[PDB]
Symmetry: D2
Subunit: 106 residues, 4 copies
């Protein structure tokens, strides 16, 4: 799929987690973020369109995705453990990653 | 790509790493494995086509990939650190992950 | 050592990364953060002394430490890859972890 | 404890996981492994008695503990999710880590 709406998927579901009442809602939302993050692994962003995929800045662009994927993995465990406020915070802390990569590659 | 290809991608580069003389070959190989593992995230394996995408086996199916992704991530760091032998061992260790998921959903 | 003293160690070093010129200052600093973070895995914080180690809340208190350990582990790879500004950024992010646990347990 | 005592803690708890019947015994055991792994972080092995604890040779010895800590954190998540067989498998796999570090530093 596209990076935007891979990014939209991530962003919508992030708010869903923010407004959630319950675990079920969070589990479903995190799973959707997992799909969009993994599916975004391929993409070449607009800033980086001519740079080589095997390029030092593509390597750093993807790394940020490993970070995100790892942070979503763990938050899903917390959700699965029905530690909701805890999943919710891990999601909030997961924001930096979004931010660090935005500042640099967008 | 096809679940099948991705598995072939992982497999093939696994041997490339087992065989490698220097860092560059290991890095390139790992990176390919990363692409295949991430791309495979959304696949529904043949043994589970009946069972829903939100089902318990599917979550456990997907979890296994989270583990692979994390292990590839770290090995690439070791490769980047020119610690080749160590990278090659981290690869060999991974094989368990491949095998835990094969025993179960294969 | 002391929980207080480890916190100090984490902080002091955190700043040393902030004012870094080179990777070596960063690697050394992170390695110490690692020692402090691991060494504090044990500690019972003041607000929790009445609570059993095996309490749901000393399970979350410790969880936070795993997050920090993981984050440092990864920043050290970045540093070891002489990816210095990048390592610096990973350090900036991991503050969230310091703050999530402060707001709750401190 | 001294490296030896933590290694025994690790070893003993691993059989306990091995023979377990219910989640509770697995979690209690993994939590102990966590303490022993974190508490070992600082130990110098004996074949490194001389080598300064900023050698890259120390750095590599500890790296292995970052790997163990991470694999324990997870297997605890699995256990906390009452996914007991899955937790048990995650412990068996994580030995490779035990085995790798024994081979090199022991
Ligand atoms: C973190 C979980 C995260 C969020 C949230 C997020 C959101 C987001 C939006 C809303 C856009 C705009 C898309 C549009 O078409 O309107 C956007 C764009 C980009 N993102 Fe992002 N994004 C998050 C995480 C990450 C991470 C970890 C990275 C890189 C490692 C990343 C990258 C990008 C890039 C590059 C863009 C530019 C897209 C474009 O304008 O074409 N995002 N993101
Ligand atoms: C580890 C990196 C890994 C390797 C290597 C690997 C290889 C592999 C092969 C060669 C096949 C056969 C496909 C073919 O037709 O040639 C195969 C098949 C499946 N596997 Fe696999 N695989 C690795 C890892 C993993 C992981 C982490 C999982 C589960 C999370 C997994 C699972 C599967 C499944 C399902 C198949 C069947 C594919 C199909 O025919 O649809 N593997 N793998
Ligand atoms: C991140 C790596 C991190 C930093 C930095 C940090 C700093 C810190 C400070 C500055 C203090 C006290 C400072 C003051 O009094 O002005 C302090 C003390 C406590 N901390 Fe902390 N800390 C970091 C990480 C973490 C994490 C991840 C946790 C929880 C898992 C945590 C918790 C605490 C607690 C409790 C205290 C109070 C200690 C006491 O007085 O006994 N910190 N830390
Ligand atoms: C994995 C969790 C793990 C286990 C289990 C383990 C066990 C273990 C034993 C049983 C000994 C010998 C003690 C006896 O009386 O039988 C031993 C010794 C050492 N270990 Fe270990 N070990 C595990 C993991 C690891 C890891 C990941 C490392 C390094 C990163 C490591 C290191 C060592 C070292 C060094 C020794 C020598 C100390 C000694 O017993 O003389 N172990 N371990
Ligand atoms: C998580 C989901 C559920 O039903 N419980 C009781 C949990 O703890
Ligand atoms: C460091 C290690 C290596 O193999 N190369 C090519 C480096 O630059
Ligand atoms: C370590 C130092 C450096 O310049 N590189 C590229 C490293 O991996
Ligand atoms: C499922 C697994 C567990 O430990 N509890 C308390 C559950 O409800
Ligand atoms: Zn769109
Ligand atoms: Zn966790
Ligand atoms: Zn590592
Ligand atoms: Zn990394
Ligand atoms: Zn997990």
């Amino acid at each position: 799929a596209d990076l935007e709406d891979n990014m939209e998927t991530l962003n919508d579901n992030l708010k869903v987690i923010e407004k959630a009442d319950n675990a079920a809602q969070v589990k479903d939302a995190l799973t959707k973020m997992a799909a969009a993050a993994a599916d975004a692994w391929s993409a070449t962003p607009p800033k980086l369109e001519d740079k080589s995929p095997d390029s030092p800045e593509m390597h750093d662009f993807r790394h940020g995705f490993w970070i995100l994927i790892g942070q979503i993995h763990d938050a899903l465990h917390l959700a699965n453990e029905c530690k909701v406020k805890e999943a919710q915070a891990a999601a909030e802390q997961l924001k930096t990653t979004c931010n660090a990569c935005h500042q640099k590659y967008r």
